[PDB]
């Protein structure tokens, strides 16, 4: 839809809402369907948010919570996710906390104390699903908020967990409907990063949200570079080692393995070559598992985790710079969600799939449908021409996406689109007209036409289009006529002779005439043959004196966040996110009037984290032009 209705700033809350948006969160401009969804939520509407990873779903309910009487209750599937959000909120001086269960009864009761006072300073109250089900202690508190009209809304994060059709089904999410029974008056809000429409639909039916406002979005991952690479067996680990050290020596990443064993093996092989790799799966003791996620999330002695897909979903950080699938994913849907969680922080990240058909026989060893999905994954890997962004979205039936993306956004081009980045698409409607006219006048096979069009001495006819494509490759000439058959401008019918010998010849297609009228134009891209590709001059843009200083500055800025983290007892990225930091460095300014103009820089954060950051930026004061 298009929510023109929810786009207005005439609303009563708009004054207060923009105040928190600018001064508390530190943001400047709303992204797609953010203002619309926020407005709607603050009008008491039932909202259903569909946005890809890193879209900006948190703002869609966190901002409304800050500008509402009472507390918003957010259901999350994992305390890890909960902990990260609460850490983000308290870092912005937004009162919030959680009852996951590992909070001792003394602390737990103290929470119930603050909620009972009916003067709560707390806007967000995160909660786990089994807690509501198991603890009848929490319920009797919420009921009191309900009576005083202080239950703002029920936010259901990761809403795809209610569906058995989802990549992560959870039993307790089915029991969330009992929360609405006791509290019907309360606005409900569901968010998910699932692109699967079949799952998206089921969420609403299962959670039984009756005709909500649906805020959808393009599930294209704007900041992910999709790579498929040839998997020469027995040197996967070496290729991961080679790639990582070349592109991301000092950044975190994930390598997905099929088995608990391949995790252990992959981690070992990488380790003995000097890479800080660790294995991550359910086979680990609870002490080990906790130790892995401690080291990886905080970037303390671990760069890469070698995890099973099942277990890798259980933890996350926003600045994952690369995700590698060591084998062949079970499905395209699976692969998209797995590689999608990379680069949540919005910075460029890499998605590398190592492919061999050998893995198919491997993977081969409604289960009939399970085989179908596998082959669709194989089709994705084998397809080395069509833009990989389109291949993924086509699997979900997403409509609207412009195939111009990788060309307009070189920094995040897929490998397929990297091949053709230098080729120019031109209009050849003239030549097509000539061709259609030639065929219309005259029994020719496609190849016969190609020869004539090229100017071969093997050409039967020299009258019409002969030599018209004298500046075409035989490779391109053949591609053009191939294109014309596909685009229905030309057609092909079988001709049989003496003994069942079938020979195809070119005729006009239904879309031929519409070209002569001038209503249809065709665009053709001339490409090199595979055995004819010329190498490219590797030498890249030279660094400038200022560009050298932002790197060094950003480096120091990063450490300041790392230190501030341990001090304030918080993950280093819940201080300043990657984009905020990168932009601070790009300003090189110590002038607070310029810093506050950057996304993520707020008065509170620049007050309690400011001195250290401004200090570093002062050193480069004589470069701030």
């Amino acid at each position: 839809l298009k929510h023109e209705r929810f786009q207005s700033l005439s609303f009563p809350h708009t004054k207060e809402m923009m105040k928190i948006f600018h001064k508390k969160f530190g943001l400047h401009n709303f992204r797609t369907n953010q203002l619309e969804a926020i407005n709607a939520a603050l009008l008491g509407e039932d909202c259903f948010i569909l946005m890809p990873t890193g879209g900006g779903k948190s703002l869609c309910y966190q901002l409304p919570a800050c500008v509402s009487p009472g507390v918003t209750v957010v259901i999350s599937p994992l305390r890890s996710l909960i902990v990260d959000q609460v850490q983000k909120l308290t870092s912005l001086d937004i009162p919030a906390t959680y009852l996951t269960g590992d909070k001792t009864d003394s602390e737990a009761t103290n929470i119930y104390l603050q909620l009972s006072k009916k003067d709560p300073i707390i806007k967000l109250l995160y909660v786990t699903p089994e807690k509501i089900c198991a603890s009848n202690r929490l319920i009797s508190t919420l009921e009191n908020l309900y009576e005083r009209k202080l239950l703002a809304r029920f936010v259901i994060d990761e809403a795809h967990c209610v569906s058995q059709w989802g990549h992560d089904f959870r039993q307790d999410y089915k029991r969330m409907n009992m929360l609405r029974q006791k509290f019907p008056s309360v606005p409900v809000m569901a968010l998910t990063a699932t692109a699967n429409p079949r799952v998206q639909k089921d969420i609403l039916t299962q959670l039984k949200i009756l005709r909500p406002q649906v805020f959808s979005m393009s599930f294209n991952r704007h900041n992910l570079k999709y790579y498929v690479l040839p998997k020469k067996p027995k040197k996967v680990a070496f290729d991961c080692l080679e790639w990582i050290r070349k592109h991301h020596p000092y950044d975190s990443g994930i390598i997905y393995c099929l088995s608990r064993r391949e995790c252990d093996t992959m981690a070992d092989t990488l380790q003995r070559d000097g890479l800080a790799a660790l294995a991550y799966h359910a086979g680990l003791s609870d002490s080990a598992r906790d130790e892995v996620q401690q080291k990886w999330i905080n970037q303390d002695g671990c760069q890469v985790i070698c995890a099973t897909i099942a277990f890798g979903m259980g933890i996350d950080k926003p600045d994952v710079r690369f995700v590698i699938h060591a084998s062949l994913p079970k499905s395209v849907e699976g692969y998209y969600q797995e590689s999608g969680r990379a680069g949540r922080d919005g910075e460029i990240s890499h998605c590398l799939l190592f492919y061999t058909y050998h893995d198919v026989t491997r993977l081969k060893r409604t289960r009939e449908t399970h085989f179908n999905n596998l082959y669709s994954m194989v089709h994705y890997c084998e397809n080395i021409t069509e833009c990989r962004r389109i291949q993924l979205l086509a699997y979900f039936g997403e409509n609207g996406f412009n195939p111009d993306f990788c060309k307009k956004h070189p920094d995040v081009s897929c490998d397929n689109c990297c091949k053709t980045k230098d080729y120019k698409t031109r209009d050849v409607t003239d030549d097509v007209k000539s061709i259609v006219r030639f065929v219309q006048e005259h029994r020719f096979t496609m190849n016969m036409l190609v020869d004539i069009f090229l100017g071969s001495k093997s050409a039967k006819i020299q009258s019409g289009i002969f030599g018209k494509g004298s500046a075409y490759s035989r490779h391109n000439a053949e591609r053009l006529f191939k294109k014309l058959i596909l685009d229905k401008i030309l057609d092909e019918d079988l001709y049989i002779n003496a003994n069942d010998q079938a020979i195809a010849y070119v005729m006009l297609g239904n879309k031929a005439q519409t070209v002569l009228n001038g209503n249809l134009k065709v665009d053709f891209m001339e490409t090199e043959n595979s055995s004819s590709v010329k190498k490219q001059k590797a030498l890249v843009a030279k660094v400038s004196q200022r560009e050298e200083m932002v790197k060094k500055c950003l480096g120091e800025l990063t450490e300041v966040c790392k230190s501030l983290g341990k001090v304030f007892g918080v993950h280093y990225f819940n201080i300043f996110n990657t984009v905020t930091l990168k932009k601070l460095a790009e300003s090189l300014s110590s002038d607070p009037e310029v810093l506050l103009q950057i996304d993520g820089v707020t008065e509170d954060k620049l007050e309690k984290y400011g001195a250290e950051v401004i200090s570093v930026l002062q050193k480069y004061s004589e470069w701030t032009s």
Partner: nanobody, 119 residues
Framework: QVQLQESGGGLVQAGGSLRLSCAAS????????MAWYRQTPGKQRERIAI???????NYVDSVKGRFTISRDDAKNTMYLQMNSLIPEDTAVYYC?????????????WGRGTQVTVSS
């Protein structure tokens, strides 16, 4: 001048699926169309699916919907994805390549492979 190597096929229970392959080899050659034939125990060869170099496909009734013929030019390979197999499909399956006009529209054949569908 042209060599056709067939792979895939064999014994399989009904309802199962098979994938036949046909790789084309030669120092140089042209392609007008490529077709799959099949020969039941007491019958002659029957063209069940055919594809042209441009991608235009064409099928017989008995296989329509179930069988999908396709070609990869970069690897000069031609497939026939056989779905929903039945004991009637039990036959020898030959690959076929028809060259274009630079050659005599020559027709090359593979040796044939057995697709046996047991109940």
């Amino acid at each position: 001048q042209v060599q056709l190597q067939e792979s895939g096929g064999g014994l399989v229970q009904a309802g199962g699926s098979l994938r036949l392959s046909c790789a084309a080899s030669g120092i140089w050659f042209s392609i007008n169309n490529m077709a799959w034939y099949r020969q039941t125990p007491g019958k002659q060869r029957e063209r069940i699916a055919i594809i042209t170099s441009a991608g235009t496909t064409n099928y017989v009734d008995s296989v329509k919907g179930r069988f999908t013929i396709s070609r990869d030019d970069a690897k000069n390979t031609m497939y026939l994805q056989m779905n929903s197999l039945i004991p009637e499909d039990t036959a020898v399956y030959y690959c076929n390549l028809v060259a274009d006009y630079d050659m005599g529209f020559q027709s090359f054949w593979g040796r044939g492979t057995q697709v046996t569908v047991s109940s």
